Write a protein that binds this ligand. Structure first.
Ligand code: B12
Ligand code: SF4
Ligand code: SF4
Ligand code: NA
Length: 701
């Protein structure tokens, strides 16, 4: 039994308070400043180590600590208290461990800092868990924590400073690698740390931490420093049990009992199988032109004029997403190599693939992944041709390292799924995963093993079969999304392929096929009816619930009451809170088939998927012509929808686009292939049932 979960829900807790119970700490109005440095590692990092890679990505993010400042619109809220809450929530959303605000005095902006800056958003990121000595990959990680954590701080400072700049206010990010103000001094004044023997000590962050700061003239309500002496209250019973929905005081200690390479969720308790729960006929799977990605189809005109127009901006309507974009786009040149590499003898003992897998897994979790799985990168997982030159893509690497980034339950529980924070929920997981995989792929290359990552911005593999084969999800009704037994459908994946030899994981079986046969919630709640209410079909050689990717693409690119859409992730019953009750309801789903229908039905009865306005922390801002304003057309504020009735699965008719109905390999964005919807509808009426496939396959056995 895993006992580290929260006993208490955070459903009434606003996001600006964060996962720690900082409001229950002893505070005073001021404290006398005193010299102090940030926590540093206990050991130095060898040439076997990560260090050079996390320093490169910190240097990349440094490029975006300052930037162009948008014109001021008329929709930025005035209240410094609301601004504070929104910015603090923004920082926690990007996984700041601890956040605070303080006023800048003249002494701070007397340096290179812009002198119009009056306020500082201070935030700390806790050191990562490191492998114990003798565990695989320890020497990859030992002594890199300050730079790994500094990278993360530089990332968050870059995004948050750009978010404020896109709202019309000059803002500059600061971290150890590039600061114009005294970080430690502001960490104390903002109430994140105290000083002990000249080193910062923060409550709750027992592992050490590193700092980032965003200074700005954007006026904010300030916080107060910690009581400089004596017990702050960190172990009070309310904090220890986390009654307000916060991190239990025992969770750190319980966590450290598991090996780092196993992750935080108990995937070891999920049944493994040699073949996936759904049928995969490799000899019948054709490789798809990357020009068949319907975003690429929309870009090239295949879906009409409006989809073409909006393809570039649809996920970048919101200033927060616009803060992430420079990082997303400029990480692409660093994704890695396709040519074979000579082993360089760095990295310690790489002769045990079982140990290499553990080290890559430990490496992922250390860098902030939520799941890691390894499978082998089969040639049919690669696109046939790229979309820009049309040239063939090679199956150049042997293995795929697949990592899931949780999109975030609490933010989505306040959102509609298709409102102004949707694309920011995708894009956050997109850049965070691209970061992590860029760093790991780079470290594989340092060890002389070709490695290349595959981002939202540039992938040469299709993630979904790798998510399946790595045992991170099952085929779900949502269609082009796989569902994980602990975080449901609430994930964005990042992959990097490599030649580094690693033991592969096996597919998982947690009963989801039988569960989805009894559930229609995501299908019922989709704004454009893109999800199938019917049975699974055969599609390009594998069994799948085929969603209508044409309808979904047009909705995500074109709908004007939000930025993109991910509502089908919010509505699934497996989208649950990380509480004892939530894990138990998942356990029951997995272990007790006779209870699945009751859980499916009570998820609607208890009105799960209804919006929680406590959690609506973001501003509704649409950028139009480079200026952030109120939304032109409004804001999706959807709640639970009703029953399409008993016969919908027989009457819904969707379009599918297997390779036959796609642009052929070699086609480029320079060509236009209007989507053949009538053929896609007829195609899907004609699809083989998975049952017939198994019969037909059996006769050639
Ligand atoms: C463009 C795109 C979309 C498009 C169109 C996809 C399409 N079919 O053309 C629309 C615009 C449809 C889309 C929608 C969403 N998608 Co999207 N999509 C992409 C993207 C970038 C490319 C798809 C592609 O490469 N070519 C299109 C061709 C290959 O499609 P296809 O032949 O029909 O095959 C699809 C499936 O059959 C599956 N697949 C392919 N081969 C095999 C083999 C087996 C055995 C199985 C089981 C599945 C499988 O993968 C393809 C996904 O489109 C990928 C990122 C990536 N590199 O995979 C994600 C991605 C697949 N989608 C993702 C997500 C999260 C979404 C959304 C929920 C929105 C969001 N919050 O981001 C919705 C969900 C829609 C749904 N009903 O499932 C995630 C899925 C992660 C997961 N948990 O499985 C991905 C992997 C991005 C990521 N990095 O996490 N997006
Ligand atoms: S299938 Fe597409 S349009 Fe429908 S809810 Fe999911 S993301 Fe939104
Ligand atoms: S909403 Fe229901 S049918 Fe859809 S993926 Fe989730 S469990 Fe499966
Ligand atoms: Na739910």
């Amino acid at each position: 039994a895993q006992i580290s979960m929260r006993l208490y829900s955070n459903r009434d807790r606003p996001n600006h308070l964060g996962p720690l119970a900082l409001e229950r700490l002893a505070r005073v109005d001021d404290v006398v400043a005193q010299p102090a440095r940030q926590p540093e590692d206990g050991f130095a990092a060898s040439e076997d180590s990560l260090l050079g890679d996390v320093e490169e990505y910190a240097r990349l993010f440094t490029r975006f600590l300052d930037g162009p400042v948008a014109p001021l619109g008329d929709a930025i809220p005035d209240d410094p208290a609301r601004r504070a809450e929104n910015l603090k929530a923004s920082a926690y959303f990007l996984d700041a461990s601890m956040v605070g605000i303080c006023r800048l005095d003249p002494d701070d902006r007397a340096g290179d800092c812009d002198p119009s800056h009056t306020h500082a958003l201070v935030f700390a990121v806790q050191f990562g868990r490191e492998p114990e000595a003798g565990e695989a990959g320890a020497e990859w990680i030992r002594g890199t924590n300050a730079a790994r954590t500094d990278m993360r701080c530089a990332e968050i400072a870059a995004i948050l400073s750009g978010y404020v700049r896109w709202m019309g206010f000059p803002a500059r990010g600061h971290f150890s690698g590039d600061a114009q103000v005294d970080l430690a001094r502001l960490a104390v004044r903002a109430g994140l740390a105290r000083v002990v023997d000249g080193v910062l000590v923060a409550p709750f962050l027992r592992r050490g931490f590193r700092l980032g700061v965003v200074t700005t003239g954007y006026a904010l309500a300030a916080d107060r420093p910690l009581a400089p002496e004596g017990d702050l209250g960190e172990t009070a019973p309310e904090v220890m049990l986390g009654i307000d929905g916060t991190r239990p005081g025992w969770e750190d200690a319980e966590e450290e009992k598991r090996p780092l390479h196993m992750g935080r969720y108990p995937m070891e308790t999920i049944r493994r199988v040699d073949e996936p729960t759904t049928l995969v006929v490799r000899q019948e799977i054709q490789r798809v032109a990357k020009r068949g990605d319907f975003f690429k189809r929309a870009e090239a005109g295949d879906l009409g004029e409006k989809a073409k127009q909006e393809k570039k901006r649809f996920p970048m309507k919101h200033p927060l997403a616009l803060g992430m974009q420079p990082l997303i786009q400029n990480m692409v040149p660093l994704q890695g190599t396709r040519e074979k590499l000579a082993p360089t003898g760095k990295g310690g003992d790489l002769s045990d693939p079982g140990r290499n897998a553990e080290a890559i897994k430990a490496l992922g979790y250390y860098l902030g992944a939520d799941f890691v799985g390894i499978c082998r990168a089969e040639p049919w997982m690669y696109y046939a041709s790229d979309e820009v030159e049309g040239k063939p893509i090679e199956a150049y690497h042997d293995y795929a390292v697949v990592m899931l980034i949780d999109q975030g339950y609490e933010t989505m529980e306040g959102a509609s799924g298709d409102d102004w924070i949707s694309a920011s929920q995708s894009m956050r997981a997109y850049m965070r995963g691209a970061e992590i995989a860029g760093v790991m792929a780079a470290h594989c290359r340092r060890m002389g093993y070709s490695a290349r990552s595959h981002s939202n911005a540039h992938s040469e593999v299709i993630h979904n079969p790798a998510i399946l084969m790595a045992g991170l999800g099952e085929v779900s009704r949502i269609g082009d999304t796989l569902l994980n037994p602990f975080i449901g459908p609430r994930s964005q994946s990042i992959v990097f392929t490599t030649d580094l030899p690693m033991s592969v994981d096996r597919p998982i079986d947690f009963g989801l096929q039988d569960f989805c046969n009894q559930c229609r919630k995501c299908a019922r709640e989709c704004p454009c009816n893109a999800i199938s209410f019917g049975d699974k079909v055969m599609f390009n050689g594998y069994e799948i619930w085929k969603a209508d990717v044409e309808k979904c693409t047009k909705y995500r690119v074109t709908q004007m009451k939000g930025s993109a859409c991910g509502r089908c992730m919010k509505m699934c019953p497996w989208n649950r809170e990380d509480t004892v009750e939530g894990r138990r309801l998942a356990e029951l789903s997995i272990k007790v088939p006779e209870a699945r229908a009751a859980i499916i039905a009570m998820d609607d009865a208890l009105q799960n998927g209804k919006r929680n306005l406590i959690k609506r922390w973001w501003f509704d801002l649409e950028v139009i012509d480079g200026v952030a304003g109120a939304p032109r057309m409004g804001t999706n504020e959807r709640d639970l929808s009703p029953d399409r009735g008993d016969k919908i699965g027989a009457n819904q008719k969707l379009a599918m686009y297997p390779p036959r109905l796609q642009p052929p390999p070699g086609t480029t964005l320079d060509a236009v292939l209007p989507v053949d919807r009538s053929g896609g509808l007829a195609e899907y009426a004609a699809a083989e049932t998975p049952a017939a496939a198994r019969a037909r396959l059996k006769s050639s056995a």
